Amino acid sequence: VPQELIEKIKLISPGTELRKALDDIINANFGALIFLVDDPKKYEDVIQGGFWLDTDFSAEKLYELSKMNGAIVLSEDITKIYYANVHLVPDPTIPTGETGTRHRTAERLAKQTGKVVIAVSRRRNIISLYYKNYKYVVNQVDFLISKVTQAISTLEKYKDNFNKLLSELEVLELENRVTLADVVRTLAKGFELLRIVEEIRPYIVELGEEGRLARMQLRELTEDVDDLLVLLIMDYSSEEVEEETAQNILQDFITRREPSPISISRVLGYDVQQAAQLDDVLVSARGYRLLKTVARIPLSIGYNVVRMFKTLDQISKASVEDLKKVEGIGEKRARAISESISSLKHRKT
Amino acid sequence: VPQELIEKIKLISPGTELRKALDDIINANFGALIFLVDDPKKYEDVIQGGFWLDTDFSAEKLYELSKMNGAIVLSEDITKIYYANVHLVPDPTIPTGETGTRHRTAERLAKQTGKVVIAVSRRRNIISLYYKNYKYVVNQVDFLISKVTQAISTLEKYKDNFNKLLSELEVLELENRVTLADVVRTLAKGFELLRIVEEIRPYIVELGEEGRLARMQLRELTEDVDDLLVLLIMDYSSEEVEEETAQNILQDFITRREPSPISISRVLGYDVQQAAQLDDVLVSARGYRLLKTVARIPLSIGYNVVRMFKTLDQISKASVEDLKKVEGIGEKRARAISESISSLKHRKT
Amino acid sequence: VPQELIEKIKLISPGTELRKALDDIINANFGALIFLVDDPKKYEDVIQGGFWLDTDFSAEKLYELSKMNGAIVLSEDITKIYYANVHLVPDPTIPTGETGTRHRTAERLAKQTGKVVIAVSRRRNIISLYYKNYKYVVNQVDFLISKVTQAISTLEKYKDNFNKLLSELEVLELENRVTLADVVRTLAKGFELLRIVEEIRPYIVELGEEGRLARMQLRELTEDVDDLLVLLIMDYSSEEVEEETAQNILQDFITRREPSPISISRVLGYDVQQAAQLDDVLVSARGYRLLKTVARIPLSIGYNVVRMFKTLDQISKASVEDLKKVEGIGEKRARAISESISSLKHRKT
Amino acid sequence: VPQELIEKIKLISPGTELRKALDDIINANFGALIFLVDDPKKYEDVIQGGFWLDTDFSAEKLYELSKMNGAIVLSEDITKIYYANVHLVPDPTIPTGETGTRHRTAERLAKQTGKVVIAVSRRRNIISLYYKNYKYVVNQVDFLISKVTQAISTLEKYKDNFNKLLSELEVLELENRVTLADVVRTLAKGFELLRIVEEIRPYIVELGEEGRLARMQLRELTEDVDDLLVLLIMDYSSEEVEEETAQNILQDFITRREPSPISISRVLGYDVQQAAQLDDVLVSARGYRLLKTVARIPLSIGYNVVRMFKTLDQISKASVEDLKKVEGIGEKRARAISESISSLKHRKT
Incomplete structure (x- = not known):
């Protein structure tokens, strides 16, 4: 258009x-x-x-x-x-x-x-x-409000399922028991959710001033979902991936490609062609998601942290002094990393 | 029709x-x-x-x-x-x-x-x-959207109650304190929920292209509910039951039979005729639900696991080596079974 | 009418x-x-x-x-x-x-x-x-569906607040730190919720066959709320109260009396006249709610359990043998009581 | 108007x-x-x-x-x-x-x-x-019900996000790991939520008798949010602040000022001008929120408690006897303070 x-x-x-x-x-x-x-x-x-x-x-x-x-x-x-x-x-x-x-x-x-x-x-x-x-x-506003209200209700159901997938994923992540199936399932649901957003966008625009509440609802339901999916991709792709790269993989699965489980895991760099294989592929998060989101470590610096420790599991074993060797980690960021992971392990696992 | x-x-x-x-x-x-x-x-x-x-x-x-x-x-x-x-x-x-x-x-x-x-x-x-x-x-779409939107809202309330029943059931399952009342109550709510889906289906079909968002909502609310109920039936029936059998019991209670507590527990193979009896009947899950859903063990192989250990409680006591004797369980699937149960016991009980 | x-x-x-x-x-x-x-x-x-x-x-x-x-x-x-x-x-x-x-x-x-x-x-x-x-x-159905849909949405918000109050109350109950304010606040919200149900009932009736989904929604949202409030009243009234008595107090606050905090706590038998006093009044649950709802002990028998131990706190200290002295408690019901309380204490407090 | x-x-x-x-x-x-x-x-x-x-x-x-x-x-x-x-x-x-x-x-x-x-x-x-x-x-009621129903749905999404922010904040508060970003993010969402309430108020008024259910819904969704935000402001402002003062800061951000992160943290008394700085500013709650809301200590008396111990962290270290030295704290209020904090630490952290 x-x-x-x-x-x-x-x-x-x-x-x-x-x-x-x-x-x-x-x-x-x-x-x-x-x-x-x-x-x-x-x-x-x-x-x-x-x-x-x-x-x-x-x-x-x-x-x-x-x-x-x-x-x-x-x-x-x-x-x-x-x-x-x-x-x-x-x-x-x-x-x-x-x-x-x-x-x-x-x-x-x-x-x-x-x-x-x-x-x-x-x-x-x-x-x-x-x-x-x-x-x-x-179209008339009443026709548009109807479709948009439905779309939003649909988004609510996708978002709830996404939160459930994620909270389970978290547990698995912290215990280092994640399989590819778990990642792909979570990405797929995320991809589908944001597709629905993309599809309803023309309706939202047609609504003009009458679309204000609708936009607020979309914003609240999708707030951090894109960042979250990008971080997941950086954490679980077969080989290391830069942020803007992961951003494009998101773009691809939102617009041009279908978020089927094999398709996702293939573009993440895994060589599977049967959906049942995903359950047998063990993966370990790099740690970007936890670093940026929970320890509030900027991506630019998280790179160095992942550079050194490779995976979340190893980061969770590092002492404050261990972490402090990284280019960018002073005692402030080191305790942030250390304490936020251990806090999470305690409460969640 | x-x-x-x-x-x-x-x-x-x-x-x-x-x-x-x-x-x-x-x-x-x-x-x-x-x-x-x-x-x-x-x-x-x-x-x-x-x-x-x-x-x-x-x-x-x-x-x-x-x-x-x-x-x-x-x-x-x-x-x-x-x-x-x-x-x-x-x-x-x-x-x-x-x-x-x-x-x-x-x-x-x-x-x-x-x-x-x-x-x-x-x-x-x-x-x-x-x-x-x-x-x-x-009918006109606006009449159909109205009934369907109501049906969906109703399904949301059934689904929330189902999740509450299930999460309590889980706790009881993991502590091996389940009674027949607990199972039947959970199955009934599941059966009723999917009945509502069956009843609204003709409306959904009449909506044609305008039923697209409605179908997505049904799918999200009911995604894994059928599998879940089948696994419950396999776990709690009086004597061991094959998957397709349990599938038929589901089919029966969705379409032809009324999901009254006595009726359900009778067809599960228990000889009760007064609803108050269910509270006094102690049951122990076979373990299919936890094996397929959490440890990602395929049903075909779970059969052998249930063959050997009989109940979830005994499976939760088995060591990795113990489990490894089963036809189909290598160290991968053995740690999957072992670790996922113990993780669950820790966080939930 | x-x-x-x-x-x-x-x-x-x-x-x-x-x-x-x-x-x-x-x-x-x-x-x-x-x-x-x-x-x-x-x-x-x-x-x-x-x-x-x-x-x-x-x-x-x-x-x-x-x-x-x-x-x-x-x-x-x-x-x-x-x-x-x-x-x-x-x-x-x-x-x-x-x-x-x-x-x-x-x-x-x-x-x-x-x-x-x-x-x-x-x-x-x-x-x-x-x-x-x-x-x-x-009235026309479309007018009635509108009011009823609103009433239901309102009930959802009351019910969520009720669940929050209750889950906090639970924690306090299990730690024996409940104050009258906590009880009254929870009862009030319960009373108001069921008032809304009573007020929308004439609309529901007017809807006839078109009120079917609406009735299902009411039933799901209010399922066990009356029993729950009756048990709370039996657990927290100033002096011991028979079930049918507590049922009438429920009836009174649903229909004839206003569920103000002082009014509720007064009819529960407490002599306060300033709302700020409720925070200073310490109360201890009799234990009926936990006995019937969680240990599945019939009220008739719970009477004897409360007869002997007086309060939940003391029941939670009793050993299986201790409990077994009660008229109606065999090893089955004794472990049910013992294990379900301790399970709850572990997971919740 | x-x-x-x-x-x-x-x-x-x-x-x-x-x-x-x-x-x-x-x-x-x-x-x-x-x-x-x-x-x-x-x-x-x-x-x-x-x-x-x-x-x-x-x-x-x-x-x-x-x-x-x-x-x-x-x-x-x-x-x-x-x-x-x-x-x-x-x-x-x-x-x-x-x-x-x-x-x-x-x-x-x-x-x-x-x-x-x-x-x-x-x-x-x-x-x-x-x-x-x-x-x-x-306007006609049907036009007004439409906007108001949308506004309420929007409020639900803001409120859910607010509860998530708060529950995370709680964890951070109890572990004494709060940063300014965490506070500001939570206040902003609270401020925006109540703005939406203010904006929909004229619609509610226009609805007259037909706005009754709508008012009940607003009341349930916003019940304690204002008190909560006032307590947060008292707990996290740069220097100590009286209740009515914090009330005005709330008033300001609801009506006249825009709740941007820098604007909020500036008026809380912090000298930042770049949003990224907030993540590096460590803050410690005074303890008013926990004292009033959980220990049920009246603000007038909480002042003395904050006077003596300064921060929540120190209050959580105080013994019953320690607390009892405060002007207003008898053994009742002292155990209330002591036990409710420790209970919370146990269950949440």
Whole structure:
């Protein structure tokens, strides 16, 4: 979905005076056919009849005008009403797959001029936006709230399962009993969860000002999940991996690749092709997750800690003095590392 | 609900171009009477008047045609519009319990020809589908989302109670203090939960493409519940039971039998007839649940482990070497069994 | 709300053929005026004109008839349609506070005859039922689902807070550090929760068949809460209290009395009048809750256990042999008591 | 939003007979123009024509009258209907930004007289209230329930994250390993949560009687959160702070200031300007939170306890006799302090 078109969709998103007018028009079963231009003179050959207005835009004015037959011409910045009650005459030879004169005119006119045209028919409650060779149908808020509320409820269930997987993983991590199956299962659930977020994003955007609570909910449910998955990938990949690399593996499984167990464990660098194999592959966390998240050790410095001790298990055996040899670890960070791991072992295992 | 009819319901489920047309028609309070055939010539005696069209189907075309009186005839694959504005004349002597000419014609015509007929009346918002001697009323999405959203909320409450029962059961299992009441109570709640899933399934299907988020939610809430109940049955039945057997006992209590406490404990092989007796019956888990789920030991091999040690309590006493005598247990699986049980005992009991 | 009237409300609750007819009638903005009798002859002086039908009831027939002016007369069991299009002429001198002829007739006629009369006006979507001197307005399902869904969401929040209070209470109970404030706070939240249930009950009933999922949700959220509160009262009242007594104290605080902290602790037998005092009053559980709920000891027998040891703290000190002296405690129940308390102390404190 | 105007909004809030009338009027697409006065004679120059009624108010009467053209005049206490079908003639020179005669009259008339005027137009479903130079649009309940239900769902997600932050904080507090980042992160989430409450409050008020369940939900979700945040501020501010002071810092971050991490930690008295610094600042709780909340020690007395021991860590080392030296601590409060801390250390760390 081009960014060019997304800028146009903003024009009619909940919160704008234009959208407010269009909601009133839909509510009254008036139709609408609206043409957005910056220089009316340049387009005087596709504009016939009607009334020259040249007056400041308002929602109420647009509403009143739409009671009349034909079309309305506004400035692109939606600050002026230029014409009302006009006949729009785009080139009839331009292909269109729309139905009815109103929507066939709209799509032809947008194709012909490279401008936005908005059509509302009298009996439906959708707003059809046309820009160049684009068509975007904009939905009512109540339809969008419904899908988004469902998506959020779905995200809650994925997130709860993710937390359960993770808390079990933690236990296994601290006891050094993790298998590849355990990692992959946890990553998959994380990947799927953020996929759902990506898929609902267009709905969220369409909601405009009415999507504010929805965005807050997404943010709260997904807050640290991306960082968490990146750290897991750095901790459990077959060979050592830089952060931005792990970030890309996340990007890949969120958007382009399917998060099947074999696919994940393969891209983590393991050579398995049967799902049952994962249970037999023993893995040991590098320790990045615990270092950044719990001991609050910056990644740049955690590299050196992993450089020296290789795995979490060995880090958990190091004394404060042992840790202090690392490039970046003073007594502050050394006790942070030492005490936070041991605290965790005590309470969790 | 025959699979034959379910295939027909798909034709008008959310997501299809046909359903899209019918939603528009309902929205406009046009009526509709639609007859699905593959060879119009064969049915020319029940088709009178109207217009021969023989043109490609589209939703917009169907919508336009439905503005006219009478009926429309489409191909069974919904790829052609054959006739519009026709008079349908099924045998008047065919019994029908429908009301009004439109729906009496629809049901007679479907009975007579063995084909699908769809009726929409002008003032109601339901789609009535008729196939042979079948009638299926298809609901609007908003009605279906409402029931399904409620069903899901109900499932959440059952699932939370199930998790509480289970976590208590776990504690009892690990301390070897389980009574039959504890098992039965946990199975019952599990059985009821999956019953609710079975009952809402027809709603989910009716939702078609609009049921996608709903299916994801069901999947997340019920993910491992069936396996879990099967393992419980294998662990607590009076005498040893094969997996597929336990699977059938699950099937029975989900569909045909009522999950009353006495009924469950009876079919598990216990001879009680008063609910108060269950508290006095001491049981000891075989260990299948812990072996498959936590130690990741495949069922086929767990059989041998249960063969040798009989109960979880005895398995928890076995040393690695002890376990290693089993057909299938190498040092890997032996430490898996040993360490995962002891880890659990430590953290939970 | 008299049970007499509740039986009448059932006649028009979701799920009945009559309610189905009335929904169609409301949906079509026909009005309705319906008179329920068992012997039409006896009431021939209030019935004028119209058509004598004397035919079997169906929803579709009622719907069709309601297209005509005037009133319809059905049998009380809603199995016969007796009259349509009649003029109802109750005594004009009978007081009524209704508006419009339709509803003034309905209430006068019900008062005069002691029968049910149903009025639906054309522009509103409510069903007004009149029985004797009673009027009950029946709501649409969508209005009721909305309030009930909210009530349930509210119950979830009360229940979560109740579980938190209880789990803290447990800890305090097991360490013998409970204060009156802790008990009262927990009872209050429990009392309020079940009040909400009582208040939403009329909505649930009005929903009829459409209230099925709602009832399941209530049941899951409140399952053991009443028993739990009764046991708390038996454990913490100033002097010993029989079960049915504690049951009544529950009944009182659910229905007639306000669950303020002073009020609760006063009726539990404590002489405080300032809320700040509760923090200074030390209490020790009798042990009924733990005995019935965790050790599965029947109340009748728990009495003897409390008879002998007085408090949970002392019960937790008793050896198996010690416990075995009680009337009803064999080695089975003695280890149940002993082991379940100690297990709990280990895991929780 | 002036309290003066809020009193007027109450007049038309769900639950009032007036609001009930207006809902019926909106439902029937009648319009309404209603003028609230206490002495009709004083305003006889803006009231022309119509019918002098001088009769008791009821919703049904208002509904009936509104079927006529023009305006209705009620007493300010909404106990009398004075006029119906009148022509309202406010000074035409009074500025107004409203559209259509009905709403331009309403706003001019309210400005001119200092009284309330209510306008309902025929095609929209909003109630416009005008008081002096104020305009307040009152929404339908279904619109308000939607936003409020969303707000509550959002609050649930904030509250869960708050509980997670807090439980981690607790662990850190008890082990004396807290950093400023940990405090600030927890305060921020708390501040944001209560902001959401403040923002939804106007919606809650607009709901009137229909906001009852919504208020209960807010109360349950936010019950002790303010006290909790105040105690955190007293425990972690750079230098000692009185309760009412901490209360104001809460007030500030809820209403006027943005709860950014640097902003919070700055006003707590720490001199940081880079967010990454917070991880390196070690802090030790004074102990107010644990003293008031868990040991049930009144703040007034906790002051003396903090006076003597300075920090929670030192309080946790004190023996009963040690504690008893404090002004206000007898053996009761001394064991309360001692035992509740040690209990917590055992179970949590």
